[PDB]
Amino acid sequence: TALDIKIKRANKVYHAGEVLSGVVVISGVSLTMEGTVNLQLSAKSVAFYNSVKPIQIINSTIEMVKPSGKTEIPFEFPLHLKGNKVLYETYHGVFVNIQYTLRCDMKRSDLTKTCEFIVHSAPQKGKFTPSPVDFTITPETLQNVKERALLPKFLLRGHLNSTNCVITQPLTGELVVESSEAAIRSVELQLVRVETCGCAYARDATEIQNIQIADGDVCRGLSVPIYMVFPRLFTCPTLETTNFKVEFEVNIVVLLHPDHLITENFPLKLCRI
Amino acid sequence: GHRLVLVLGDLHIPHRCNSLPAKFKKLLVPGKIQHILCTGNLCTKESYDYLKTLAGDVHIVRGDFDENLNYPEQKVVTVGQFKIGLIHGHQVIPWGDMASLALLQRQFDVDILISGHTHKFEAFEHENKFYINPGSATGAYNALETNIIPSFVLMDIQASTVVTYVYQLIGDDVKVERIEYKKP
Amino acid sequence: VFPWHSRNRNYKAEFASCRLEAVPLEFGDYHPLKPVGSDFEPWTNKRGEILARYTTTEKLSINLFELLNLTQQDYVNRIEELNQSLKDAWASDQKVKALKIVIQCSKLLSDTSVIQFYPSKFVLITDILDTFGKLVYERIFSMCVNANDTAKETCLNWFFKIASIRELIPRFYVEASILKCNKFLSKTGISECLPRLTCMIRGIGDPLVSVYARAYLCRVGMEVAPHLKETLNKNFFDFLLTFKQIHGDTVQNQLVVQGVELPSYLPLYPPAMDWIFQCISYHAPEALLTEMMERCKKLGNNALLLNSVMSAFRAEFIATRSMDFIGMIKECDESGFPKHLLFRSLGLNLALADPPESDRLQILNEAWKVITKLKNPQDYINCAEVWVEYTCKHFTKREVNTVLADVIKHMTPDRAFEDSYPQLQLIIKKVIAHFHDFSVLFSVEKFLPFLDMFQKESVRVEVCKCIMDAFIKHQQEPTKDPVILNALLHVCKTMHDSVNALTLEDEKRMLSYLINGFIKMVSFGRDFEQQLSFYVESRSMFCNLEPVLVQLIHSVNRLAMETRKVMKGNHSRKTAAFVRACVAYCFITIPSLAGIFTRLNLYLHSGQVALANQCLSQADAFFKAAISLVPEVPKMINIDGKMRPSESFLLEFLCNFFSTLLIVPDHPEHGVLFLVRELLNVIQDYTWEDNSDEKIRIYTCVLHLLSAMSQETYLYHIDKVDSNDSLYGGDSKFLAENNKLCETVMAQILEHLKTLAKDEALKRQSSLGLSFFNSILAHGDLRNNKLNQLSVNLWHLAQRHG
């Protein structure tokens, strides 16, 4: 008296046109494949934009067994959406969450289990052009003249290989601490999701992960390698639709010895090729 | 089938001799000796170790001066179709008496008896019995002789015929002598 | 029973008739006797030294996820508990807990609260990482059996989880731990991940943490992909880029805050640079080693770097470039890493590979000019132990003498010996290892004063055993150079004075073997008197050890017989006194012996060697003393530490004594059969065991002896001693007395046989009867009617009871 769903692919990723095939294992029963875009209302930023409501991507139900031992039964769905409705990338965000789930339920006089399968956006048409960016973290980067006076004199030079990043490829670059009067306690990368909901409109920025790249007083003139692996389901290609936007930024924050923090923001543009 | 045995005795190292005569070490090579019978007076574990590097079968009995006393006083070991009896020799009263050796072979009921207290080499047949006294390999002194020549005997046993090659160093020359024995 | 008649025996005629004809052999006649690899030192070994040396007594703190005031042993126990928790969590299918435990353990490596404990700490925590690295790998391998999609998915999940780690040092350590798993993602995964980790290490700002991280990365690379050396060279180059930070301002301030002096902060670095350089220089081409050498030279305070250059590079490279390394050592700053450590490393290199011939004298001179200026005795001996090997291997005895004198000069003042008993031993061993001929070793003037340095008892005696082993195994001919004798005499004295009541028997055996090895090799040529002088000073010198006395007795008897053989028996007036002195020497010497059966056997051998020189009176004294000693034999004796009966040994001793007294003449002032008569009295009076019948065996032996001696001519004779056969000339009275003794012995034997028959022990009675019949057949004249009847009766009695 127990159910389980086994999706054929180990990685459980399926593209916008493939076929979702698997086996349901037991020890009448139906199975429903539902994809949802859950948008969570937030603190107002700008008529209260009361259009932030769940969006159903896909709805498909199969009556699998009409009303012992280890039993297995195959199943399959076609991943198709009319002619213009796109299957959004799986995205475990905070205010925008795009999730595809299979739900198997068996009636009794009802045992249910939900298993999530990932959907990957189709590769772009393809003219991938990296956009290398050079930057200089200086005391003239903090957006306050009042605090800037207490900042020790520092100068860091860096080069991001591309702000237009392939999501399967890591963010690579170099950072050279040309000269810092105060000892550098830590330099870390901070991937910040920028999620927007509604129209003329709630916009939030939330940290996904922090990855420290420089610990302690690094040699002055040594190229510390900026390396960052994008998280699997917490990052998606930059998505824009009339109801919601999901963008991504990276914040290089330098920490100095007397608890001083300096932020440089680079808006990335993730894509799949 | 040929069996090679090294009949030895009275090394007395180092109680009376520093080591074997220089040549006798050269004439003796490892991997070529099948048996090694010693009448005794090894006097050290070192001489026994030297013998152990010369063959695998090492039958050695107790002398009047052996450091290790676990040595059996009398030994009877069978090689080929023959049985050899081994004692040091100082048990016989008097030394080298043919009557005493005959009595000892009667007690042993053995084909051939080895008894080498008297360092002077002997080899004789009496009453269809074979008797070998190899003498001192290192030529250790004894009160019973004036000049002692180093000597050591080599059994060669084939079925029922034993040819004995005795190596004696006289002056600076290694004379070798042959004797023959056949079981009736 | 019945009287005895002796069968006539003609020994010469019987031997001639029974002698087998022998055919000599000419030349040409056939007689049988005719004619990563093993060169890579693994991290497992270095584990022990790093853990042993780097120990701190300060209270440590292990903060996870808070614990304070922990000792080193408790710190190790807590790390072992963390490792066991890792293993249990993995075996319980809790992989996330395993990952978090490994992450925290790696986090511990980012803390430098106690600098002195960092190396050993690095060795402990890394073990957990290794335990992680294998334990993950097997799992994917367990899924493998270009692997299946499940194994690849698990491997990618692990790599993503590890790539999600925030702190840099934990991320690097955990990711490098599972570098092997990169095999399951692509054939180029390791070749694409190793350079990235090497570059990632640049983020570590603390020099010590970065250096040990580089060491771990090199270890993982060599135990995973040892064919990617081109990638790992970047570790050495980036390390040289970072080396400026070791002596920089930030680290100095950190040490000041922790209150740690630089002379103690620096020696924490070699454990990691040695590994880095060894991995990077393994089978490297000479061009790469050269380039590393000049890149190390061009820096500043590179005194530390040079050490690793000697500690890792092949011995040949450093040996050829040894003069340049001397030059580099010379300008090193004194306040930094010690210079004597660099000199020790260089000397260790020169102990394996020889330097160029033209430079050896300059190298030795410039090394000793710096070594002799050290003030601390301990590091001085650390250098000198290493460099004595070089001085003894390449140069002559004069330089060895100078080095030994310098060592003595340094260590004598402040009783420093106690701190360097082991090292000094090593030195002395080396001096003996390269000086085989002992006419040269003891020509070294300061060799004996060096032995005088070891004033402790246990330490000194071991060096003496080493000297004596070297002498016995490197001296194949007798020597006489008085320098040799006096020196070995002193060594044997100072080794024999260690024998006391507490000394074990095995120690006494080993010491006796060594002093015997010395004594055997002193041969005074034809100067027999001075050889006896050596023997008397030896007995006075080596009194305590019994086997030395035994060997001395044997050797003085050997000298007596050697004089006999040299003079061909014709004793001279001058040499009669010498042989009498030798035999009196032996007479004095035996009674001192402790063992009993040894005393008896040596008394006999002394007797026989005594009669060999026509000197009869003291020989009779020997036999009388032996007889008087006979009753002291115990029933139960000691053999090889165990306890064994003394029955058969007593039998063989008496048998030998009888066989000897065959030839011994009887003094005219006394009666016939004299010594035989007292021996008979003693054996009759001996407290023989009730269940023992070897006494009648000995009476049968008595019958054998008297029958043999009743013959006209004895079987064997002494060179110039008139035995009873020639003294009495077969007198009728002597034969009658012998026959009366025969009747007495036979009456005793028959009485014993009757007692055995009355005792109902028929097996022993039958054996006795058979043996007595065999004896009668041997010697008893069967022609006599009474003796033949007695033999027939004995045979019938033996056959009656089997």
3-state secondary structure A114-165: EEECEECCCCCCCCCCCCCEEEEECCCCCCCHHHHCCCCCEEEEEEECCCCC
Please name the member of B14, B73, B143 whose beta carbon is closest to the beta carbon of C652. B73
Asked if residue A273 is part of any domain, the answer here is no
Inter-chain touch B68–C640, beta carbons under 8 Å: yes
User: What resolution, expressed in A, was reported for this entry?
Assistant: 2.9
| Rounded Cα–Cα distance for residues A259 and A182 (Å) | 10
- Residues A112, A140, single domain; the answer is no
State how far residue B146 is from chain C, nearest Cα, in angstroms.
7
Of B4, B97, B125, the CB nearest to C18: B125
**Could you tell me whether strands B173-182 and A184-197 are parallel, antiparallel, or unpaired per DSSP bridges?**
unpaired
C-alpha to C-alpha distance for A65 and A44, rounded to whole angstroms = 48
Residue with tokens 């107002």: A44
Same-domain check for residues A15 and A71? yes
Q: Identify the H or E element spanning C345.
A: helix C339-350
Q: Is residue A8 part of a domain?
A: yes
Residue A193 lies in a domain: yes
CA distance A180 to A153: 6
For A170, which residue in chain C has the nearest alpha carbon?
C163
Prior bond to A139 cis, omega within 30?
Answer: no
> Quick one: A10 and A108 in the same domain?
yes
Contact B11, B43 (CB under 8 A): yes
Minimum-distance CB partner of B70 among C640, C717, C719? C640
What distance in Å separates the CA atoms of residue C197 and residue C228, rounded to the nearest whole number? 13
Residue (of C336, C341, C335, C432) closest to C380 by Cα position: C341
**Is A114 domain-assigned?**
yes
Known binding residue B128? Answer is: no
Q: Kindly give the interhelix angle for C118-144 and C72-91, rounded to the nearest 10 degrees.
A: 10
Q: Please, are residues A118 and A90 in contact by the beta-carbon 8 Å criterion?
A: yes
**Unique residue bearing structure tokens 């043996």:** C771
- Pairwise CB contact (< 8 Å): C32 & B156: yes
Residue of B nearest to C608 (CA): B143
Q: What is the domain partition of chain B in residue ranges?
A: 3-160
The method recorded for this entry reads cryo-EM
Separation CA C467–CA C396 (nearest Å): 20
Are the beta carbons of A239 and A88 closer than 8 angstroms? yes
The answer to whether the Cα torsion of C429, C431, C436, C438 is positive or negative is negative
Q: Is residue A62 part of a domain?
A: yes
Partners of B177 on chain C (C-beta within 8 Å) are 22-25
Task: Report whether B43 contacts C579 (CB < 8 A).
Answer: no
Pairing type for strands A13-14 and A111-116 reads unpaired
Q: Which chains touch A (3 or more CB pairs under 8 A)?
A: C
Select from C164, C56, C76, C169 the least CA-distant residue to C127. C76
Residues A200 and A257 in one domain: yes
Q: Do the bridges between strand A171-180 and strand A223-228 make them parallel or antiparallel, or are there none, so unpaired?
A: antiparallel
Rounded-to-integer distance, Cα A214 and Cα A227, Å: 11
Touching subunits of C (3+ CB pairs, under 8 Å) are: A, B
Pairing type for strands A171-180 and A154-160 reads: antiparallel
What interhelical angle do C762-778 and C785-800 show, nearest 10? 150
Two tokens, residue C95: 């992989």
Q: Give how many domains chain A has, as a whole number.
A: 2
Q: Is the dihedral of CA B118, B134, B102, B83 positive or negative?
A: positive
Count of beta carbons in the 10 Å neighbourhood of residue C466: 15
DSSP string, C264-291: HHGGGSHHHHHHHHHHHTTT--HHHHHH
- Cα separation, C20 vs C12, in Å, equals 14
Other Cβ atoms within 10 Å of C770 Cβ, number:
17
Sign of the CA dihedral with A25 first, then A29, A33, and A38 last: negative
Residue A217 is assigned to a structural domain of this protein: yes
CB pair distance less than 8 Å for A214 and C203: yes
Q: Which residue from C minimizes the CA distance to A218?
A: C205
Q: Is the peptide bond before C42 cis (omega within 30 degrees of 0)?
A: no
**CA pair distance C781, C775, nearest whole angstrom:** 11
CB B18 within 8 A of CB C521: no
Q: What angle do CA A179, A182, A188 make, to 5 degrees?
A: 80
Give the SS3 label for residue C509: helix
Amino acid occupying residue A107: K
Using N-to-C axis directions, what is the helix angle for C118-144 and C149-163, rounded to 10°?
Answer: 150
Q: Please report, in angstroms and rounded to a whole number, the separation of the first and last CA atoms in chain A.
A: 45
Whether residue A169 is found in the same domain as residue A93: no
DSSP for C173-222, please give it.
HHHHHTGGGGGGT-TTHHHHHHHHHHHHGGGB-SHHHHHHHHHHHHHHHH
Check residue B40 and report its DSSP letter. S
C109 burial level (CB within 10 Å; 0-12, 13-18, 19+): buried
Range of the domain at A114: 3-119
Neighbours of chain B (3+ CB pairs under 8 A): C
**Closest residue to C718, CB basis, from B95, B96, B143:** B143
Q: Is A268 exposed, middle or buried (0-12, 13-18, 19+ CB in 10 A)?
A: buried
CA gap B164, C31 in Å, rounded? 10
Q: Is B119 annotated as a binding residue?
A: yes
Q: Which two three-digit tokens encode residue A84?
A: 């213009």
Say if residue A206 is in the same domain as residue A94: no
Last residue of a domain, one of A91, A119, A147: A119
Specify whether A137 is located in the same domain as A251.
yes
Distance from CA of C255 to the nearest CA of A (A): 15
Q: Answer whether C199 touches A (CB < 8 Å).
A: yes
User: Measuring CA to CA, which residue among C612, C489, C599 is closest to residue C560?
Assistant: C612
Do A247 and A177 form a contact (C-beta atoms < 8 A)? no
Residue with token string 């000796």: B33
Q: How far is A190 from chain C (nearest CA, A)?
A: 10
Distances (CA, A) of C18 to A5, A17, C9: 107, 117, 13
Rounded CA separation A231/A168 (Å): 10
Q: Do chains B and A touch (3 or more CB pairs under 8 A)?
A: no
Residue C78: DSSP 8-state: H
Of A119, A152, A169, the position where a domain reaches its end is: A119
Among the partner-chain residues B27, B94, B179, the one whose CB lies closest to the CB of C662 is: B94
Of C250, C255, C249, C245, give the one whose Cα is nearest residue C114. Answer: C255
User: Closest to C25 (Cβ–Cβ): which among B18, B141, B176?
Assistant: B176
Task: Tell me the residue length of chain B.
Answer: 184
Contact criterion met (CB < 8 Å) for A223 and C150: no
Backbone CA torsion sign across C602, C605, C611, C612: negative
Q: Are A10 and C152 in contact (CB under 8 A)?
A: yes
Residues of A in contact with C199 (CB under 8 A): 225
Residues of chain B found within 8 Å of residue C21, distances taken between Cβ atoms: 179
Nearest to C532 by CA among C594, C593, C577, C471: C577
Provide the CATH number for the domain formed by B3-160 in this structure. 3.60.21.10
Give the position of tokens 């032995």: C451
Location of structure tokens 């115990």? C634
B41 labeled part of a ligand binding site: yes
CB contact under 8 A, B175 and C652: no
* Phi/psi at C407 (5° precision): -65, -45
Long-range CB contacts (within 8 A, 24+) of A111-115:
A111/A1, A111/A2, A111/A3, A112/A3, A113/A3, A113/A4, A113/A5, A115/A5, A115/A7
Q: Are C221 and C231 in contact (CB under 8 A)?
A: yes
Judge contact between A234 and A209, C-beta under 8 A.
yes
Helix (H, G, I), strand (E, B) or coil at C674: helix
Count of CB atoms situated within 10 Å of the CB of C86: 22
Distance CA C175, CA C198 (A): 12
Q: Is B64 annotated as a binding residue?
A: yes
Strand-pairing partners, residue B178, are: B165, C23
Q: Collapsing DSSP states into helix, strand and coil, what is residue B35? A: strand
CA angle C311/C315/C318 to nearest 5° reads 80
> How far does A216 lie from chain C, in Å, by closest CA?
4
Distances, alpha carbon A216 to alpha carbons A252, C57, C111, C163, in Å: 16, 27, 11, 20
Residue A213 buriedness (CB in 10 A; 0-12 / 13-18 / 19+): buried
d(CA C438, CA C300): 49
Q: Is residue A125 part of a domain?
A: no
* CATH classification of the domain holding A112: 2.60.40.640
Q: Is residue A128 part of a domain?
A: no
Residue of B28, B93, B124, B136 to mutate when probing chain C, most C C-beta within 10 A: B93
Q: Is A117 buried (19+), middle (13-18) or exposed (0-12) by CB count in 10 A?
A: buried
Mutation for testing the A interface, residue in C245, C246, C247 having most A CBs under 10 Å: C245
Q: Do C171 and A211 touch (CB under 8 A)?
A: yes
Q: Residue C206 in contact with residue C265, Cβ under 8 Å?
A: no
Contacts of A126 (CB under 8 A, 6+ apart): A273
Query: Residue A98 in contact with residue A245, Cβ under 8 Å?
Result: no
